[PDB]
Predict the structure.
Amino acid sequence: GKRLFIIKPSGFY
Amino acid sequence: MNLFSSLTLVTLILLTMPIAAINFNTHKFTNYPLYVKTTISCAFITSMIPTMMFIHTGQEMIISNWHWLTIQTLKLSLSFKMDFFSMMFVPVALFVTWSIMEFSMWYMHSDPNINQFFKYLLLFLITMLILVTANNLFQLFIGWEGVGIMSFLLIGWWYGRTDANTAALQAILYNRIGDIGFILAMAWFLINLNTWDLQQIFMLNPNDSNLPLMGLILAATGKSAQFGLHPWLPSAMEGPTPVSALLHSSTMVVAGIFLLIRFYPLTENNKFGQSIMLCLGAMTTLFTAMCALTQNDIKKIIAFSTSSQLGLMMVTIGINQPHLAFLHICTHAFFKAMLFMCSGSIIHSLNDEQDIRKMGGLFKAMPFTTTALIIGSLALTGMPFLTGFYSKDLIIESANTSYTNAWALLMTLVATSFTAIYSTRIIFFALLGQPRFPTLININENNPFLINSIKRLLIGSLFAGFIISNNIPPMTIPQMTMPHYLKMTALTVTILGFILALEISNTTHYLKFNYPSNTFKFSNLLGYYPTIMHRLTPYM
Amino acid sequence: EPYPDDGMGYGDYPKLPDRSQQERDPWYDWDHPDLRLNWGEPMHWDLDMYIRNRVDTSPTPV
Amino acid sequence: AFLPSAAYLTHQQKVLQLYKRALRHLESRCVHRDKYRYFACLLRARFDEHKNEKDMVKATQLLREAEKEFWHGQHPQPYIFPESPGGTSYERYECYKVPEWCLDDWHPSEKAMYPDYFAKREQWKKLRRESWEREVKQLQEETPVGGPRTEALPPARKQGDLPPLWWHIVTRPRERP
Amino acid sequence: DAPPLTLEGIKDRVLYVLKLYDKIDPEKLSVNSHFMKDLGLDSLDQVEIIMAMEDEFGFEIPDIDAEKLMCPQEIVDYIADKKDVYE
Amino acid sequence: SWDKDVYPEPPRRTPAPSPQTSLPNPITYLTKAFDLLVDRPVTLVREFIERQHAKNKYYYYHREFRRVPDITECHEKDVLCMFEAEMQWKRDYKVDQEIVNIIQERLKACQQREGESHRQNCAKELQQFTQVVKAYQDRYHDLGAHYSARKCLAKQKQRMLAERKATKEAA
Amino acid sequence: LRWQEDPEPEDENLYEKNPDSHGYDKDPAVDVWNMRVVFFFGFSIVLVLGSTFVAYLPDYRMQEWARREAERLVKYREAHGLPLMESNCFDPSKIQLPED
Amino acid sequence: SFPKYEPSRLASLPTTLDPAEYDISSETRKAQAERLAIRSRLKREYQLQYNDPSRRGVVEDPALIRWTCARSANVYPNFRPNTKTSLLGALFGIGPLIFWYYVFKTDRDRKEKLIQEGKLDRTFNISY
Amino acid sequence: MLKYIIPTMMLMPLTWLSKNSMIWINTTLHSLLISLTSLLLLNQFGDNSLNFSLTFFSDSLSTPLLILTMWLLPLMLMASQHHLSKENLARKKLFISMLILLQLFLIMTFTATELIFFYIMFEATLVPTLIIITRWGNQTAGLYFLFYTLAGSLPLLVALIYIQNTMGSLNFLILQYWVQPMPNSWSNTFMWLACMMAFMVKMPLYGLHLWLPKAHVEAPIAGSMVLAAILLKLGGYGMMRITLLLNPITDFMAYPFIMLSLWGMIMTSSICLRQTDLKSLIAYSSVSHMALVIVAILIQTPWSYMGATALMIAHGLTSSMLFCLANSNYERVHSRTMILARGLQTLLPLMAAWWLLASLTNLALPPSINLIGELFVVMSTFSWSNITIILMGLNMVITALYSLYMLITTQRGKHTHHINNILPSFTRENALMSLHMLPLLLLSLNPKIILGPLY
Ligand SMILES: CCCCCCCCCCCCCCCCCC(=O)OC[C@H](COP(=O)([O-])OC[C@H](O)COP(=O)([O-])OC[C@H](COC(=O)CCCCCCCCCCCCCCCCC)OC(=O)CCCCCCCCCCCCCCCCC)OC(=O)CCCCCCCCCCCCCCCCC
Ligand SMILES: CCCCCCCCCCCCCCCCCC(=O)OC[C@H](COP(=O)([O-])OCC[N+](C)(C)C)OC(=O)CCCCCCCCCCCCCCCCC
Ligand SMILES: CCCCCCCCCCCCCCCCCC(=O)OC[C@H](COP(=O)([O-])OCC[N+](C)(C)C)OC(=O)CCCCCCCCCCCCCCCCC
Ligand SMILES: CCCCCCCCCCCCCCCCCC(=O)OC[C@H](COP(=O)(O)OCCN)OC(=O)CCCCCCCCCCCCCCCCC
């Protein structure tokens, strides 16, 4: 567990 | 006819297919690096059939398949040349690349841009096989600039680091200084022979070919990191370890040597080009192997090692023995990629530690890496009947026994001793001695990716010199009658280098502090050459 | 201290001591950590040139 | 020389920094651990031999010739730690250290993939924007007139208030993003 | 590779280094044990303790932070600040 | 296909394979696997498509340009005739370019097909290539980027004056 | 004091009022139809059909003809023993020279 | 005794061997206090606007705008005709033009003299 | 050419009669229809040009310039609609009308059969360009116009009227057949400079180039696109039409100016290594690339003209894409300082990929048509003199460096801390980048249409 959130820019657009 | 050319083009189209896969995506891949590793495995197996039916007969051909551009007398066709050089360099490059990518599934496993990494590495492979299958100078210039641009993109892989971008821009600058000479060569062949196709260049047979061969030698000096234009290859260890393993040991850095081997019918009619190549190659293999004697970063040591071997290749082109140089390329690829892979396994085990002064105790701590790196160091030094014996010693046997610059021969022998010196330096500081690294031992090498990737190049470093050297047809006459002090030259000077550097290594356990003189400060600061020309020439 | 008034067009711009950004404090909490420089501080005239991608001023042991 | 809090290195701090850099260059010269251990005790004893010296001008003189000894006995390539500046792995992951404010500019269909994370991030933003004016008025009365003299920031004082200029220190990226 | 350290693990490693040190008695060493005031140590010994921390964990502490770590609790707190533990 | 007169080739003589050893090589088995798995489906697909071609047979033609008077028998500054002479000379210039290209194709094919004995066996193709490049160089070289029939005729007249003076001083 | 002037307006962010903004216009129907117009008459009309049109240009500046015509003439002058190309472009009989 | 480090413009003097680090006089104390004051003041004025949640934009540096306006917009009005600037505008402005002009004219006169005599190897030269 | 001029003029009621929100969509749609129509200009032959009428004709030189000109207008309308969204509606229609009128002037500048009609259209293009730069530019003498018209346009006018009175016509088709050799004199020398210097300034020539790195900075995006993409190539087109009449005097009068270019492409390229302004860096790169077009026109060999028209088309595409990338950063950080915003691959990966492609085509990475033009110019100048290759190759070092330094400064490194308005890439911006780059990549698959009248 104890996963870390990947801080990334917006890859949707 | 129908099988050879078909599988030839199937290898290249198969390499281009995962580029279309990575470009035509929407979803998140079910292990795209496994897909590219399987693809390059299959491209190796595909390219082995034209190699076997070249070993059988010697069947060469040309695929001039797409008429691209006709500039009034110049029919630029998409023209592939399947001769001895393509047939013996393409499966070696594919085998090394497949090993590097199964290494890269483990070394670059925590990368969130692993898809871009394998895309760039496959683009490099595509451009290099454009470079070594090219039949005209335009397509060879495409492959040449392609490996230069993928050198930029794979040295600056961690682009947030300033030194990575610095080394990438440095590598671009030295390769464009080589590109001056290559475009000079293209200009000479178009104005005086009306061609870029290699067939008409070889047929018209120019006598006043000093200027195009000086252009090709400047191109090789830029590309193969010879003297004057070497320092980008020591700077080029800043990128990832599979980048410095695939590109800057075995695949990219041999392209200038491959360019001068490809033009052997022109260099064999010019003593001036042979003399320039012999002098510059002896200069390089002295200077770079001497600068390897005083380094502590392990990737710097193996970068100076591969540049010294490229200088040895330049020597054995300068003695008009091109096929021995090409066999030294195809031999050098296996164990030098394996030495970078074992150094990267040591780096990754010791938590990104590249300095040999904080290594040691890795004889039994990393036993498979120990075994493979000892076999790689022996195949570097020219241990008898390993793969490095089947070309390099033969080089010495033709460097002694010919109408040759004697000082270039003597510097070649001094460089041969220096190779053994830094090889046992690597073994002494890295695998021998006592642990000098930090206290939380996370040393591990139990991944089937790493085991299989070092294993296949280890089978290569044990057998491929014998197998390739017995599968060639004889394109030269081997000098096989020579006096006994001259037959036993390279082995004796190698063992003398071993013993003198074991004395140098056993000086380190003495409890005596000596001030370093001008020799250690000279060689440790890279022969003073990247200091001045990187501060003084961009200032002016 | 400004540049020597000969007409080269520097104006009132300060002659910084001509040291590169490698000799600036690498552990210091910089405003621009890649350039090792602070806000409002008068930059060198060749600040584009003394970057850590380019020509250095650092001392060598020889 | 160049310090954030203070404006100079003291004589004691100069002796500590010269001793520490001397041992680092010594270990660069003294690769093996036991040999460095013996020479490190010798260098410690040589620094102890001039420890209880009371004349400051004579101490500055000895520190000057100690700098000459240091410059004479240094290594060309000292050992540098990888994450330390100048190392091989320094500022490697700065291409992965994405700042936090770009999380404010996502599409809602990729914010709905992580509902609890942004629902928990909004109270961090609320805490920041209702702590900001309190820590501004805490700065403007605690900083003396003529600007702050040193770069040291004060802590909070009230039970329920946050320290000033805190957001980009707490929300700075990790060493391994 | 690079296992996730915890404050209990970092504290045990710091006290494990400092209990291998001949000027620290292992029954008097605590987390609030100051070096110049609870162990009576020299500033040279404090420099060598920080250098032992640097050789231990694999990174360098700058001198502006090395001159100010005067107890193992501050050493564990600085390693927690420069390693981002308890995520 | 093409014409074997404009693209001459020597007859391809291969030797029959006489295996000295007893080991079966993978080349013949991969050749027969290529003939079953690959060659026959490609051949049947090409047969179906070629039948679909032959169900509507129709022809295109090579355009024939009759000879018009050249620039020499055009009156000076008469654009209606020297236009025709200029287009005649441009089409002939492009066709001469492609003739030089055909001879280059022959020379490269001879060099590759002879392999190592190319300097012996391709002296005829090298001699024809030297003839056609000497002719192209005497005919069109150094005309510049604004080349025309007038510039080519002026070069030919200067060359003929040099040749006439060279022959006259010889006799 | 100085003249009465509107202050500098801040730059608007098109994702605030429209998280599906394509950047063309603030009206979302106008924005999405501008996107469809640009992507249809930019890529589907000009690029695809343009590459198809340029790919099938009918013998652009008659090079192919000039190959095939060359394939006539060399074939004509391997049979009649004529050399492959004359050094003279025109007939030297129909050239008057300036005498001397 | 020991070698002195001799400085260079491309390799400057270090922090340690410079004598002005080992001065303890009162004007050095006051200059370090003034530089600390200005640096702390500019640091505070920076990281207020940097941490300001109302500002969604660019903290403008007057030093960076000052540097960009110096590199381009202060060029011509501070140009004065004297010895040094005019001799460098002649030495670096039209000097290499004269150099490459006479080199290229010498080379092309040599080549055209070889060609009109029929002495240059121009055998397979038909692309130009 | 009347099938292209009339839709171009019908774009005026199409931009004024449209609705208040429809004057970008209608103009973009119908200008893309005209740009699709523009491929019928490729009806070219190996001997004869495509001669429509007494007024209009289009050979293989003007045809790629026309296709690029009619392709540039929808791209300028995509580029300039963001920052004009805060502009008045009638002034918005004025801007679009100035772009349409400039296209109208250009498409019959390139197809003018007669040389004084070419001159009137050539000097008529300067009025909408100056209106666009002075009105929709951002920041604030004027002596550049005076120095331009003294050494340039009116000597060209007197020169063409003199050719009109001597030859009897300024039809280029007649002057192909009635061209006379121009001997060495002083009258013919000032005649040659009067014919050439207007196009020399319009390229620009080095030493006469300083108007451009200010006119690019004081411009909007559409003004920069039409300057660096088409208007700098009017000089090259005019030179390739006017060097017909100017033989063989050019064979000894091209010697000074070639020096100014062969050293100029060394200097301005190195000036690109010392820039702080991104838009000025693209401007000095444009000067350094047009220097080779000047050299290749002045040495007047066939390989040089093929390389020069390939380099004109490829440089129009590449420089317009670089100005649009600089626009995309100027519309986020509101400052053209190159060292201000860094590390933008960490935020905008696809935009950094477009930066990578634009920098690869800038440094002439093969098999791009940038490298095709660059390579053929280097071949022809090696035939001119065997020393110039050094001055070529040193250029081809530096043209790599600032192409990648611009890629390393803006797109790599640590991102700037105090800049938090970096939005994600809008769909319009990536559409603009792709419509610049995908034609430039597709022309590598078939380059013979952009290689001029003498392929
Ligand atoms: C007429 C029919 C034609 C059909 C065939 C098409 C011909 C080619 C057209 C162009 C192909 C590339 C287009 C995509 C790249 C640009 C956008 C992008 O980044 O997308 C990434 C994206 C996938 O990446 P991602 O992870 O999603 O996002 C990107 C990342 O964020 C971050 O990005 P990144 O850095 O990870 O990735 C960028 C990477 C970065 O890599 C590099 O920069 C390295 C490249 C240079 C070195 C290696 C190549 C050296 C030269 C050798 C190759 C050419 C000759 C080969 C032949 C043999 C030798 C002669 O580049 C690529 O992956 C591109 C591969 C192809 C490159 C083409 C050449 C570009 C180099 C510069 C110019 C060179 C001269 C011109 C050559 C033209 C050849 C046709 O791809 C797509 O979304 C693809 C969409 C569909 C593209 C259609 C293209 C055609 C449009 C034309 C329409 C009309 C005709 C109909 C044809 C339709 C075909 C489908
Ligand atoms: C992946 C999808 C593929 C298609 C799948 C579905 C179709 C069915 C499968 C079979 C394929 C289709 C039928 C066969 C193909 C068509 C045959 C045919 O007539 O082809 C006509 C022609 C053959 O050439 P050509 O000589 O007949 O025509 C050229 C035109 N002239 C002579 C006027 C110049 O075109 C092709 O075959 C194109 C194939 C190109 C393949 C390689 C592309 C590389 C791109 C590099 C660009 C830059 C190069 C620069 C360097 C060049 C060297 C200096
Ligand atoms: C033109 C001047 C103005 C410039 C701007 C213009 C903007 C307006 C745009 C209008 C539309 C576009 C016009 C240009 C179109 C150019 C394209 C075109 O038509 O080409 C014709 C060319 C024609 O080539 P050809 O000469 O062989 O044609 C043969 C002739 N026919 C077809 C009649 C038999 O088309 C092709 O070459 C297509 C070949 C197949 C598709 C490509 C296959 C290879 C692709 C890469 C494979 C992977 C390789 C490895 C790469 C790995 C990654 C790096
Ligand atoms: C067969 C014959 C063989 C002949 C061989 C000898 C001939 C060649 C002689 C040597 C020429 C190359 C060496 C001189 C220039 C080297 C520039 C360079 O590489 O600079 C590197 C430097 C960063 O490197 P570094 O500081 O080491 O990195 C540590 C990380 N901070 O990076 C920087 O500082 C960035 C600099 C950017 C600006 C550079 C401006 C100058 C450009 C010079 C181009 C040279 C063109 C030469 C043309 C030759 C034509 C024939």
Notes: Chains F and D do not touch (no CB pair under 8 Å). The two ends of chain F are 53 Å apart (CA to CA). The pocket of 1,2-diacyl-SN-glycero-3-phosphocholine (ligand 2) is lined by residues B 66-68, 76, 78, 136, 138-139; G 63-64; I 367, 444-445 (CB under 6 Å).
